[PDB]
Design a binder for this molecule. Structure first.
Ligand SMILES: Cc1cc2nc3c(=O)[nH]c(=O)nc-3n(C[C@H](O)[C@H](O)[C@H](O)COP(=O)(O)OP(=O)(O)OC[C@H]3O[C@@H](n4cnc5c(N)ncnc54)[C@H](O)[C@@H]3O)c2cc1C
Ligand SMILES: Cc1cc2nc3c(=O)[nH]c(=O)nc-3n(C[C@H](O)[C@H](O)[C@H](O)COP(=O)(O)OP(=O)(O)OC[C@H]3O[C@@H](n4cnc5c(N)ncnc54)[C@H](O)[C@@H]3O)c2cc1C
Lengths: 482, 472
């Protein structure tokens, strides 16, 4: 109704809060603002709501990770070892992609329903800040719509970081977006970037039959902030699965050849040992960067930081005090739940509340198998900061739930403060890290000790018992079952 | 010759073997007596471990054999059950973990005595071995961890052939054409679901009007039952079993009636599983000669240090009161031994979680709605369905919900109830929250990773705290 302002709807709007972008940060901020009593508008330029995470991000990638893992379980040794015998296991890639698209479409429609349920006005168009208290939306038909608003919340998100000299065409040279919709399993695939996204998508296609190699300029996998012991052990596990890595390696160029294949030229990051690697599909995921194109920032005088982020204060105010920014467009880990939480507390602050977020309590997850997840500080951070800490480790090989499922890679590692026993970091490599890292985030919120967690009665048999036992080891020096 | 010990543990189940390890780690000279051929007690040998293994394997068989994998583009011409192989995978896990306990005993210098333990004096345990030989342990303290056994059904004799307990049901040699389960508690629903998935026509008969045993939330139980019924698991609730007859042809005639009276009928099956309960096991332990009287249900009365009326003789686990669960026995074993060493002894049974490892899973900790009503507590409710959770939607596995009960005035979390995927792992975050006295607001404001199933726990708390969630 009046809750959707698409092409042809061009009357001026008065709002209390105007959110630019409908990703995890923006759509949650919009809902929360309306729930707080603000007259709220959310502007989105794309055909669907939900931003990067829903449309080309978390959701399609997790769907393919799930499906590709199940294909591996059926097509490999796992099901046979359980007495589940199958004549011929065949991949129907079109059908697997259909399952992914169904999940995306359902959740995109969910956001639209939530906007309507909460009476958020959805303006479909390209938003540009045209005054301290005004956003102009330009729509697909060329029409414009003015929103005069008390507050503006920039949640314009991120884009793929281009590799200079390598042209992404989402055909044979793909970004994460193209890699999520390949029409056939490539015989050989090269991934530029062994960060979270690259390892996830590489593992997907490796499970489905591709020969996969990831090239990384740095000397570890898993992106920034990951614990080095965890990263090394994770890499070793992925290599045994067949995922190959060339770390400390820079890519010097890529050439599409006549036969349709791609020659990737590489050498040691410092220089030397030049070689060429050939592939059928090249995935470029060297990073993501904040997206602020045509937002009006320069005219407003809001200068960006050297990496393209909008500088904000602890209330998420830009230098113009009624203009705010959250999510992938500002500093901090580029994660959906981070954007969501910043959006909530920002609008809570607009309503007069306190604004505080502890980025040491924001978890990171890698949804491979085994999964990786961590929250708090790594050993390297504690060392850099001069913190005196102790370590507790527990392997999943000694966990009854993991052993019974014959799924026993990895360990839980707990870092605790020597004097006070306070949990400083939790790092999980193995099955179920997704859900276990959230128990750790709750503990960190309270400043809980390793002993605190060790004395919680965790259900037996569960993967979380390994978390309990790692904390027991950190607190008292020894676990029970290892 | 006799062994001199500081702590002598009778039984090597979750309670006993962990207590023994902990006692040795504290410096006690520790002996653990076990009558069975392997360590690990009920949980490892005929309990948690074999049941969870078959639950996993039969679930995966269901996914491959049914609609699920096809819907994901994983196409298979012919999916065949090899029951001998599925049982072998189960036995492999059991064997590895039983040997793991033996290794941990060796690593921690626990002395393993194989035999039937009887307390023969205030400071003496005698273990009698299968051949009749004896081993005497003179000991400062005795820790009774003798566990539980299946509760028999009067008039029905279990022979582990066609009328089985959980032990026999875990090792059937073939999928029975028709199977009747007496008792729709946790064990009965788990084992019935295993065999239903593998091809058996399964019906559970329950005297009460709900599935899932004592303490489960009624709303959760009803929604859980309807999901299982749509899978093909049939239930006769409010129904009493009047008898069972082993027949000449090898089948079983089960007589039933309405629990209140009336509607008498007979049901025939190939296998009858009797799981109406479990009871503490103290046979031939020497309690009567010591003057240690049992409570009316057969449990050993103990004080807050888990001392019996003889203060150097202790009891923990399934042989004492409280929920009959492995993690409960383990924690009691640890804190009992800590108390022997002089430390504080604390366990909050309101923070001890319960899990049902079906698919969907069920897990809860704290109080149910019925419990809060009985106690006169003024509470509020927050619910969040997995249909609205992004992680569940990505796997297309969207039954169930999280339900949070909070104290109306103070926002304190009073109970957490999970029906759906990953409940078994999610309830541990809930247990930590209850131990900490968390508020619904506390949890709502913790940054949970996206997309994860735990976000539904966050959103249910938000709904309980602020009145509304974000994504529903
Ligand atoms: C392949 C992949 C997998 C990922 N997996 C995960 C994961 O498992 N977990 C996780 O936490 N994160 C994951 N991420 C990251 C996650 O997607 C982002 O951190 C998150 O989407 C950021 O949310 P946001 O709201 O800040 O921005 P975005 O989601 O990027 O949303 C910004 C929105 O604003 C719109 N917009 C921009 N400018 C304008 C304008 N001028 N007018 C109108 N609309 C505008 C855009 O169209 C877009 O919809 C993944 C990312 C990728 C690429
Ligand atoms: C089918 C089934 C499934 C289950 N699933 C779960 C689950 O998923 N999660 C959960 O938490 N719980 C589960 N349980 C319950 C769990 O098995 C018990 O709560 C737990 O094993 C109790 O531990 P315990 O140490 O007190 O006793 P037990 O495990 O029963 O161990 C007692 C031990 O003492 C030995 N013993 C007894 N008397 C003597 C004596 N006189 N001398 C020497 N040795 C002696 C016995 O042989 C035995 O090894 C399940 C139970 C069953 C039957």
């Amino acid at each position: 109704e009046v809750l959707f302002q698409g092409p042809g709807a061009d009357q001026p709007i008065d709002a209390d809060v105007t959110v630019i972008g409908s990703g995890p940060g923006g759509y949650v901020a919009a809902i929360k603002a309306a729930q707080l009593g603000f007259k709220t508008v959310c502007i989105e330029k794309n055909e669907t709501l939900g931003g990067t995470c829903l449309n080309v991000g978390c959701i399609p990638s997790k769907a393919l990770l799930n499906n590709s893992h199940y294909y591996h379980m059926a097509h490999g040794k796992d099901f046979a070892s359980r007495g589940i015998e199958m004549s011929e296991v065949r991949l129907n890639l079109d059908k697997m992609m259909e399952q992914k698209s169904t999940a995306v479409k359902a959740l995109t429609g969910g956001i639209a329903h939530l906007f309507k349920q909460n009476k958020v006005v959805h303006v479909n168009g390209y938003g540009k800040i045209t005054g301290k208290n005004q956003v102009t939306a330009t729509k697909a038909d060329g029409g414009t719509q003015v929103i005069d608003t008390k507050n503006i919340l920039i949640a314009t998100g991120s884009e793929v970081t281009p590799f200079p000299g390598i042209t992404i065409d989402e055909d044979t040279i793909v970004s994460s977006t193209g890699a999520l919709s390949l029409k056939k399993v490539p015989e050989k695939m090269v991934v530029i970037g062994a960060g979270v996204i690259g390892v996830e998508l590489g593992s997907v296609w490796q499970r489905l039959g591709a020969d996969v190699t990831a090239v990384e300029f740095l000397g570890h996998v898993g992106g920034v902030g990951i614990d080095m012991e965890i990263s090394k052990n994770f890499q070793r596990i992925l290599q045994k699965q067949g995922f190959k890595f060339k770390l400390n390696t820079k890519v010097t160029g890529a050439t599409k050849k006549s036969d349709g294949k791609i020659d990737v030229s590489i050498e040691a990051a410092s220089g030397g040992k030049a070689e060429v690697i050939t592939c059928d599909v090249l995935l470029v995921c060297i990073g993501r960067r904040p997206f602020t194109k045509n937002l009006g920032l320069e005219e407003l005088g809001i200068e960006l930081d050297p990496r393209g982020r909008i500088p904000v204060n602890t209330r998420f105010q830009t230098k113009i005090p009624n203009i705010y920014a959250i999510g992938d467009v500002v500093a901090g880990p580029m994660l959906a739940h981070k954007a969501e939480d910043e959006g909530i507390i920002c609008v809570e602050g607009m309503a007069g509340g306190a604004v505080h977020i502890d980025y040491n309590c924001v978890p990171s997850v890698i949804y491979t198998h085994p999964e990786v997840a961590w929250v708090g500080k790594s050993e390297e951070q504690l060392k850099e900061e001069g913190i005196e800490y102790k370590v507790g480790k527990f392997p999943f090989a000694a966990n009854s739930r993991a052993k019974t499922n014959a799924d026993t890679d990895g360990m839980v590692k707990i870092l605790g403060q020597k004097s006070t026993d306070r949990v400083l970091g939790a790092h999980i490599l193995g099955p179920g890290a997704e859900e276990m890292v959230n128990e750790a985030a709750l503990a960190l919120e309270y400043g809980a000790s390793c002993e605190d967690i060790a004395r919680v009665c965790h259900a037996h048999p569960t993967l979380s018992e390994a978390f309990r036992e790692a904390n027991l080891a950190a607190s008292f020096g020894k676990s029970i079952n290892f």
